[PDB]
Design a protein around this ligand. Structure first.
Ligand SMILES: [Cl-]
Ligand SMILES: [Cl-]
Ligand SMILES: [Zn+2]
Length: 179
DNA sequence: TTCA
């Protein structure tokens, strides 16, 4: 495979500044007799394109992953913006999850996409569809740096405010999802 | 610098 340019990672996953783009790093994992099987072929990253948000481009590539319906797979997204509602993507993901019940999705967002006035409805719909929605933490940024980025042995260097932003967004998300 |  290949790895993300470090400048692209830092400018798109900084949880204190937005970009007019969305990146999505993904991995697929399976638990077998209590062990983590995570294939290299099931890991990658992508970005949004004109008229197609990143979440939908991940849906586009699921057939190529060749998942087996006899097994449960845990799919994790590290996504620079939380999925939207108004352009249809939360509904598309919900439908996908209902049609592919062997897929269990974890959505870890660096930022909340509240440009969408219906951003709360997106998160609640994804939760209602069985997805585990959370806000990326320090450890998850470091994991993505170490796992998906062409870093060349350089360790993760956190930006100022990372923790303050992450914990603020996590509190926001708790209130959005609380019942 | 909110999927411009
Ligand atoms: Cl979306
Ligand atoms: Cl707020
Ligand atoms: Zn969308």
């Amino acid at each position: 495979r290949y790895l993300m340019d470090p400048d692209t990672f830092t400018s798109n996953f900084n949880n204190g500044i937005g970009r007019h783009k969305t990146y999505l790093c993904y991995e697929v994992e399976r638990l077998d007799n209590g062990t983590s099987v995570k294939m290299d072929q099931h890991m990658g990253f992508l970005c949004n394109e004109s008229g197609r948000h990143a979440a939908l481009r991940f849906l586009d590539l699921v057939p190529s992953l060749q998942l087996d319906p006899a097994q449960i797979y845990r799919v994790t997204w590290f996504i620079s913006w939380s999925p939207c509602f108004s352009w249809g993507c939360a509904g598309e993901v919900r439908a996908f999850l209902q049609e592919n019940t062997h897929v269990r999705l974890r959505i870890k967002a660096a930022r909340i996409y509240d440009y969408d006035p219906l951003y709360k409805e997106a998160l609640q719909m994804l939760r209602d569809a069985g997805a585990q929605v959370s806000i990326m933490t320090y450890d998850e940024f470091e994991y993505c740096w170490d796992t998906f980025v062409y870093r060349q042995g350089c360790p993760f260097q956190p930006w100022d405010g990372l923790e303050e932003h992450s914990q603020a967004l996590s509190g926001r998300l708790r209130a959005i999802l609380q019942l």
